[PDB]
Amino acid sequence: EAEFGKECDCSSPENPCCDAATCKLRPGAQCGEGLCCEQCKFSRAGKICRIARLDDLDDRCTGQSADCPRYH
Per-residue burial over 23-55, b = 16 or more CB atoms within 10 Å of its CB, e = otherwise: bebbeebbbbebbbbeebebbeeebebeeeeee
Q: What is the C-alpha to C-alpha distance for residues 13 and 21, in angstroms, rounded to an integer?
A: 8
Q: Is 55 left (phi over 0), alpha (psi -120 to 50) or beta?
A: alpha
**CB-based contacts of 37: which residues, under 8 Å, 6+ apart?**
30, 31, 43, 66
Q: Which domains does the chain have, with CATH numbers?
A: 1-72 (4.10.70.10)
- Resolution stated for this PDB structure, in Å: 1.4
Residues whose CB falls within 8 Å of the CB of residue 13, separated by 6 or more in sequence, listed in order: 20, 23
d(CA 31, CA 37): 6
In sequence order, what E strands does the chain have?
A: 18-19, 24-25, 37-38, 41-42, 48-50, 59-60
